Write an enzyme that holds these catalytic residues in place. Structure first.
Site, PDB file in Angstrom:
ATOM      1  N   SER A 170       0.779  -1.225   0.000  1.00  0.00           N
ATOM      2  CA  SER A 170       0.000   0.000   0.000  1.00  0.00           C
ATOM      3  C   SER A 170       0.805   1.267   0.000  1.00  0.00           C
ATOM      4  O   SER A 170       0.180   2.335  -0.103  1.00  0.00           O
ATOM      5  CB  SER A 170      -0.946   0.019   1.190  1.00  0.00           C
ATOM      6  N   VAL A 171       2.155   1.253  -0.025  1.00  0.00           N
ATOM      7  CA  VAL A 171       2.868   2.476  -0.406  1.00  0.00           C
ATOM      8  C   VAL A 171       2.413   2.900  -1.818  1.00  0.00           C
ATOM      9  O   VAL A 171       2.392   4.082  -2.142  1.00  0.00           O
ATOM     10  CB  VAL A 171       4.379   2.322  -0.253  1.00  0.00           C
TER      11      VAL A 171
END
Ligand code: NA
Ligand code: NA
Ligand code: NA
Ligand code: NA
Ligand code: NA
Ligand code: NA
Lengths: 384, 384
Positions: B104-105
């Site tokens: 999820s970066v």
């Protein structure tokens, strides 16, 4: 049972990871660094529409060459004369450093890896395949020698009618991940190869992609390396290539040796340069001088009964994963469907790469056009 | 029906090619140059075993840092102070220029693309999602604004219990190609998003990966570009990156915007550099100064009720696809499961990238260890 295979990463269990396990430990350390081997993936370009035609020298002798390239659906074309790029062409939309699928030009790379291991004494071509892959007992590959697989001289029941999903050619693709699996398909390429049968006869050429995948299996058994890694260690990493190559992999991580390599046109030419340099590349010797000489010499002419080849090249033959024209120039080529060639012109010390996308995998007419270009360009390079 | 989507290549029919059609014309011209977007593929290295620890400056203040990195399963770690790399570490087996999955970066990159389009006036965050994606009528996304998707302030029935294959979290992955499809699964990510429901309430933070994929869908509708291409044109191609990024794609070619980007640690740091440079990168402005200022300012604190975050960061919040600690340093971070961070330390003009492979996606203890490293390193960079 297909026996031992090289683990996807050090310590991996057989078959791991799968598409359903790669996020779990211990697989995830490897998978997070290699996710394109598990899930289809796109490049997000670091760089922010027109054909590049740099036909050089040959443009004078072949003034309509760019048109002839367009007519044969050319994506990338490159002529290496000695060590020098003397002509190049890339279609609109295909950059000079883009990679292109090689189709069965990939076979000639696999044969090269086998030749490296023959030079090291790790493969003896006179031995039966089952010396290296005993799990092929009971298949068409029980009996034939490794050299007979290298020269494609094994009769195999292998239906080439790709419109029919029950054909071996389509089944082989689905087993390797090139198509969506059907119920009852083999789980991976190794299992598919063990299903193959034939009448037991040998000595006549029969072009069959399964042979190359058997060669790659043998490479894995003798080296303990994944074919992906053996292709790098024995070949790609010695070329001083601009880019990595890529290879499609099946669900076990086995590279599709017969057909799935992609690379740049310029880098493919380095393979041809190595063959015209007697087997030596910038990073070291790849294969022996003898192996190269045997490729250039050709296979047994009487084994070659494929009129798709001999109508054009009556003295042609096949050996060690290369097509040998037997023409007056001694041309030899890797060939793949839809117009791929790694063509050697030893008279002029030149390599021609042509990577294309014909609408059809094969017709007689596309081959006539493509060979006419390759021969015209070769002749354009002669001293006059 | 999910409406119009950007074609895989110019002229492509909806959905084409598929895994069963890419060898056919007209698809094959594109597919032969992009086959890793269709079939899992491995790199064949052009280059022919030990951790690299170059801890610099900070090594004096943090003498056990390498051990603390090992204990948190660190793959790559890099500190950029101003424009200078001042510390780096890569585990054995992970080269400095290897790519790593961002998890999820990736969301923070997607939010950046949205911000670019807000700056151009092509997205107005106050508009309902259905202004841009009318096919989300009748779903949980019918009613909420684009800003509410950016800030994840929509209540959604989205089971996070990934052990259960019927959970939304697992279904979302299978719909996108991260797991093997089950009977009855949605065919692609767009269809999955249209299945989502909720009670209609908004304004409270609920972390949900579906939100980011809705943002990427909006990006496609407003630009007509594949998300893969928009991520390059609006962000990646402006960074002066060393390497392309990659992104996993579903069977339609839609990039998995919430989780599927991979890139090098050094290149990820260029995204943080752009945020600390007020939105400007070497290739041009990426986002406005105002957008960066709003990210650094944080979201509404009262919306943030995730005690996994606020037990550590009591004044924390979330906005525009970034986590805002609200700490005394004003740290902000992109975060992804298994230990990924793009951490900004505006006081010291520094960016910390940490890319890891914890055995677990999340525990409280891994977050405590990881945040302790990131805060210690940030403090080590203060003037003394
Ligand atoms: Na096929
Ligand atoms: Na030599
Ligand atoms: Na040899
Ligand atoms: Na999953
Ligand atoms: Na600025
Ligand atoms: Na902006």
């Amino acid at each position: 049972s297909t026996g031992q295979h090289p683990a996807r990463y050090p310590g991996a269990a057989a078959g791991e990871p799968t598409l359903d396990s790669w996020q779990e430990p211990p697989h995830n350390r490897w998978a997070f660094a290699h996710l394109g081997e598990m899930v289809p993936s796109a490049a997000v370009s670091r760089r922010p529409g027109h054909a590049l035609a740099r036909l050089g020298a040959i443009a004078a002798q072949l003034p309509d060459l760019e048109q002839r390239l367009e007519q044969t659906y050319t994506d990338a074309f490159l002529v290496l004369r000695g060590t020098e790029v003397v002509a190049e062409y890339y279609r609109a939309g295909f950059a000079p450093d883009d990679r292109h699928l090689l189709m069965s030009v990939s076979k000639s790379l696999c044969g090269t890896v086998v030749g490296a291991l023959v030079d090291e004494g790790r493969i003896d071509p006179a031995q039966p395949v089952t010396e290296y892959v005993p799990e092929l007992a009971g298949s068409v590959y029980d009996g034939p020698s490794v050299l007979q697989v290298l020269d494609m001289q094994i009769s195999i029941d292998y239906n080439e009618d790709y419109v029919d999903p029950a054909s071996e050619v389509q089944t082989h693709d689905r087993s390797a991940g090139w198509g969506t699996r059907r119920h009852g398909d083999p789980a991976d390429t190794y299992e598919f190869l063990t299903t193959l049968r034939g009448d037991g006869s040998t000595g006549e050429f029969q072009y069959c992609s399964a042979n190359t995948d058997v060669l790659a299996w043998i490479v894995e058994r003798v080296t303990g390396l994944r074919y992906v890694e053996a292709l790098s260690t024995y070949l790609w990493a010695k070329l001083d290539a601009d880019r990595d190559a890529t290879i499609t992999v099946d669900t076990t991580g086995f590279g599709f040796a017969n057909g799935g390599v992609s690379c740049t046109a310029r880098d493919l030419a380095r393979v041809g340069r190595m063959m015209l340099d007697g087997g030596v590349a910038p990073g070291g010797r790849v294969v022996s001088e003898d192996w190269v000489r045997r490729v250039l010499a050709g296979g047994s002419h009487e084994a070659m009964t494929d009129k798709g080849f001999t109508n054009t090249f009556p003295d042609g033959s096949y050996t060690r994963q290369w097509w040998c024209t037997g023409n007056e120039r001694g041309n030899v080529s890797g060939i793949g469907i839809h117009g791929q060639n790694l063509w050697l012109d030893p008279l002029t010390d030149s390599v021609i790469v042509k990577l294309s996308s014909w609408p059809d995998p094969y017709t007689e007419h596309w081959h006539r056009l493509q060979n006419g270009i390759l021969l015209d360009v070769s002749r354009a390079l002669d001293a006059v």
